[PDB]
Amino acid sequence: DMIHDAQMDYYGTRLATCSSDRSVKIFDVRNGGQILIADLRGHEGPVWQVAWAHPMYGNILASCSYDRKVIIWREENGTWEKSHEHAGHDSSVNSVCWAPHDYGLILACGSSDGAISLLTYTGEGQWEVKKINNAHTIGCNAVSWAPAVVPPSGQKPNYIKRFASGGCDNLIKLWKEEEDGQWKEEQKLEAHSDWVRDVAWAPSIGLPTSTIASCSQDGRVFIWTCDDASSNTWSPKLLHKFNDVVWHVSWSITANILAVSGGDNKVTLWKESVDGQWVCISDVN
Template identity: 40%
Template sequence: MEVETNHIDQINDLQMNHSGTLLATCSIDCVIKIFKIENESQKLITKLQGHKAPVWKVRWANPKFGTMIASCSEDGCVIIWGENNGVWKQYFSKSNFSSSVNSIDWAPYQYGLILACGTLNDKIVVITRGERQWSETQWNSLQNGVHCVCWAPFVPEGSLTGSSGPVMKTKKRIASGGQDGIIKIWGYNEKDGWVHEENLIGHTDLISSLVWCKSIGMPRSLLASGSHDKSVRVWSQETTQTKTNKQSFQLGNKKQQQQQQQQKIQIYQWKQQKLPVFSDIIWNVTWSLTGNLLAVSSGNNNVTLWEENKDGKWLQVYQEK
């Protein structure tokens, strides 16, 4: 299906809502458009105008929080828009980033209504809606400008991520991609807040797209990255869990032997696999819902699909020109 948006300039991003009934587009013309998709036809619902420069990204919030979308722009502003009874308005606006906001991503809904932002002046900002107001946390990423951010998926306790048992308690994690070609992994803990955990080094130019695979049930984390160095890399981090028996003795009138079962979780270093070199810069990478397919769009207007074979190699299975 083709959608005629009637933007007067280049479209920078588009995204469907979770149910596939609404499409949002944003453009260099500073406008966001919302279309209703039904029976392979589209109808323009509204135009959202509030940015004063090109809009780079739009992201739908989980429907648990209502019909809500976030946008970021070269004007250094992030706006969260919401719809109520057919009327769209701004729920929140932050305009003091002092540089272009290049990327935004909503956290898994289990954490609450939380938005991560990456800026050209090297800041990562996490905006959280509390009970009465919005709050923010920010830090310097030391990446010569943050071009993209993405959240790790929420993994509920008891989910099977390995053959040996349930995964450890999930932790908030964010990946950020810089203009220096470096990917950084950030983790959150109650004591220290957001902490830099690791650098993923392999790309030699700006990271244009970064997305964590949201499929659970696998004994690993998967992260895909695309770059202006004309390459796509799939990063994987294995997690295993083993159970061991430990003997302990309780002394008293009688000596009693107890069996205690302990669980040991082993998290391995990140590994990378580089897909065959593309002929042009990479604009976007995205995972299928099941996590078994990776879509790549490049500067030569090609879209390719990639699938991992039984030997762990990613092979091209489809191409659209």
């Protein structure tokens, strides 16, 4: 009937769709032609978000549902069997995304009972679930990692370690890591008035000014950007203010055009001008 989130695969290949009928359909797009391949079904609740993995670790695609469980099925030799299954959450899952392509196979999924998840695959498939509780006041609703931030020998290059999450209590920013057991998040930023819907970080195209967009239920779209690297500055900029609530908010990779999806069942493309103010490009549909 009504779909929730439908993200593409790699280089415009398949299109894993998710609706409210507990059906994770993986449709193929060949020269603009939509064609279904398989229908992964095995959840008691409605499917929410879905994110595909990188092509270096085969062909994995994780999808969240409302049955307090996370399914991660593979795709090889026409067999879309469910590989790993993580059910460490207490309530339903809202958002579920993966890390970078160079981070192996790390996926972060947020729950609704004030907790999250972080499945890190090892050398075989033993996902070490290291989660807890006490997150936001109502739970999580947004989960998206930031850009692949880089760190002189001749082996595996370093990056920035793993540390990313997101709540719904009018607080959505990045996080910091360390050199101990896991990571110690440190990035407090509050500028919203109601429940935060979606919050996707913008991918950096080589520049150090990393930005992060967010959308709440009040109708405002904040764009929090940093001044420099390793600086204590998280000033947010209001892009637009609508009368209705916003759903999701995606960003492009070339010009980093913000795709504001929400309001009156219409998507709008926002792009930063030379003066610094965000203006609407055109209207979708």
